[PDB]
């Protein structure tokens, strides 16, 4: 199974050019944080089927959109796996 975590530079590969310092230890950005486009807001890693063998399935922010992290929701789906929803707020 995958896991929501902050990817590492060495033990985790396939790192997007976007920043990762905004993520917490659990891979979820705290609400009330200013971010820009392409920034990573959810960090997910997937083990490689048979160190440095973890696909990075991180979801970055839309490159054309900015804003502040309005809300973060963590829960479980129907089958019990983890589930995260991040709502971003901006002003037009």
């Amino acid at each position: 199974v995958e896991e929501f975590e902050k990817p590492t530079r060495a033990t985790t590969l396939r790192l997007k050019h976007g920043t990762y310092e905004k993520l917490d230890e659990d891979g979820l950005i705290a609400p009330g944080v200013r971010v820009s486009g392409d920034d990573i807001i959810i960090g997910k890693t997937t083990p490689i089927p048979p160190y440095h063998t973890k696909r990075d399935a991180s979801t970055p922010l839309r490159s054309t959109e900015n804003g502040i992290v309005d809300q973060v929701l963590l829960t479980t789906n129907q089958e019990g796996l983890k589930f995260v929803k991040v709502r971003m707020r901006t002003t037009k």
Binding site: E25, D26, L28, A30, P31, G32, V33, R34, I68, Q71, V72, L73, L74, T75, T76, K82
Partner: peptide, 27 residues
Amino acid sequence: SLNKSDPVRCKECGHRVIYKARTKRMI
């Protein structure tokens, strides 16, 4: 508080929906 080991549930009332607390950093 959670330590990435506990199941995703409220400690007190056992609710299955939780939110992240607001960061302490200034904005």
